[PDB]
Design a protein around this ligand. Structure first.
Ligand code: ATP
Ligand code: MG
Ligand code: MG
Length: 325
């Protein structure tokens, strides 16, 4: 199918979408304050990246102390005491949330690299809360700043996120390998490679200068019937099938141009040595996190999952991202 054909199907799939977070922010701050009236609440993830809250997305929150915010560019400790501190505050908050909302499922999730409290309330009211960490707010502000440069590119990212959840590529599905955040990094990397975006050094993002709850950023339908959308989608798929060399290169926002696996030591010798979360890291599909030290966002992409990804990338061309029936 042509770009126009693809663009039409896609604009056609979001028509229901085009036809809010304040109060949830406040409900959560009611809980945070009950634990500690000096603790701040910051928002991040898709709500922040896009400036729009999608149906079927959660909200990401983090609790910060005043001194965490003032150290606006500090890194996050990856130590066992940092994690102990985060668990301790989150336990307390979790207990307050259950008190104040008897009907919510409040899960203290301990599977993970970062301690998290996952709350499902029923009114499709879904959110993750973490503590004492800037990196989530910084990476979302970074991505936001990129999409603020070229607002219509959010439709490419939004199209790629939905497709990834529908094909089982997205980590939110059983067998999935790459988070939504991972996909965003890929979209922006691609856009940078094609000059649809101007490079932003990750170090220039300062948490002491971000909004706890950033303003909404209007999203308008593609007015060209989606020609540019459809063109961007096919080019994105071509790029990641035929241009990006997954054997030699890293999807990275830390520098403009090419980052190699060799300069990071993201090699077969490193996999033998390299563990994370208590399991193997893979370096088959490499996505450098712009803030965390030595973190491959594609660490779960085994050779099999890398196979699955390529196949779905190939297949997405003919079906316009699963939109042609
Ligand atoms: N693979 C990963 N490695 C490290 N950090 C991650 C990873 N995936 C997500 N995160 C963190 O979680 C935050 C939110 O990520 P998430 O995958 O939920 O993306 P999202 O854009 O909020 O999309 P969704 O609509 O799926 O919620 C990110 O800012 C990032 O800090
Ligand atoms: Mg999210
Ligand atoms: Mg998530």
């Amino acid at each position: 199918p042509s770009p126009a054909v693809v663009g039409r199907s896609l604009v056609n799939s979001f028509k229901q979408f085009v036809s809010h977070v304040d109060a949830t922010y406040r409900l959560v701050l009611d809980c945070v304050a009950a634990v500690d009236p000096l603790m701040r609440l910051y928002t991040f993830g898709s709500t922040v990246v896009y400036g729009v809250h999608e149906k079927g997305s959660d909200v990401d929150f983090v609790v910060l102390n005043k001194t965490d915010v003032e150290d606006g560019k500090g890194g996050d400790a990856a130590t066992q005491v940092a994690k102990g501190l985060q668990a301790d505050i989150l336990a307390k908050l979790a207990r307050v949330i259950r008190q104040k909302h008897l009907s919510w499922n409040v899960e203290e999730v301990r599977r993970t690299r970062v301690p998290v409290v996952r709350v499902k309330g029923g009114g499709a009211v879904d959110f993750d809360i973490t503590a004492y960490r800037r990196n989530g707010v910084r990476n979302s502000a970074l991505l936001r700043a990129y999409f603020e440069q070229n607002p219509p590119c959010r439709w490419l990212s939004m199209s790629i996120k939905r497709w990834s959840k529908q094909t089982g590529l997205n980590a939110s599905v059983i067998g999935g390998s790459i988070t939504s955040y991972g996909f965003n990094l890929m979209v922006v990397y691609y856009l940078l490679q094609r000059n649809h975006l101007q490079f932003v050094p990750p170090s220039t993002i300062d948490v002491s200068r971000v909004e706890p709850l950033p303003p909404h950023l209007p999203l308008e339908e593609p007015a060209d019937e989606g020609l540019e959308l459809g063109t961007q989608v096919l080019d994105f798929l071509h790029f990641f099938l035929h241009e990006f060399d997954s054997d030699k290169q890293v999807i990275s926002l830390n520098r403009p141009g090419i980052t190699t696996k060799e300069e990071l030591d993201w090699t077969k010798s490193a996999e033998d040595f390299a563990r994370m979360n208590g399991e193997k890291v893979h370096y088959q599909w490499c996505i450098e996190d712009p803030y965390e030290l030595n973190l491959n966002v594609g660490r779960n992409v085994t050779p099999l999952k890398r196979d699955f990804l390529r196949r779905h990338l190939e297949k997405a061309r003919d079906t316009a991202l699963l939109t042609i029936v």
